[PDB]
Amino acid sequence: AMIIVASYTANLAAFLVLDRPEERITGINDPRLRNPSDKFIYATVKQSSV
Amino acid sequence: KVFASTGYGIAIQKDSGWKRQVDLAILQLFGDGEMEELEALWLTGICHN
Numbered sequence: 001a002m003i004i005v006a007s008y009t010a011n012l013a014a015f016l017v018l019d020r021p022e023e024r025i026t027g028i029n030d031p032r033l034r035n036p037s038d039k040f041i042y043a044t045v046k047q048s049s050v
Numbered sequence: 051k052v053f054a055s056t057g058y059g060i061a062i063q064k065d066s067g068w069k070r071q072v073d074l075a076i077l078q079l080f081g082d083g084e085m086e087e088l089e090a091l092w093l094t095g096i097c098h099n
Contacts, residue, residue: 023096031094 025033036042044050062068079085
């Protein structure tokens, strides 16, 4: 029973804070930007300095 | 970990004289590291690390 409640508390806190999957782009040097897919509208506004 | 030590190579059959030119040109291209920058343009993934 002490093994059970200890393992349950470790599964609780582990599932609480383990990780988060992240697909955040880096910036100008990211290959999904520079070689874009068909799904990638990386457009902007017109008549800008960009 | 992979199960082979293989290598892609450019082929010209019997390569009369030009083999000496092209191989030193390849070692020249490896001698400057722009090949590594070409990997940054082409051969870089996002989801491995």
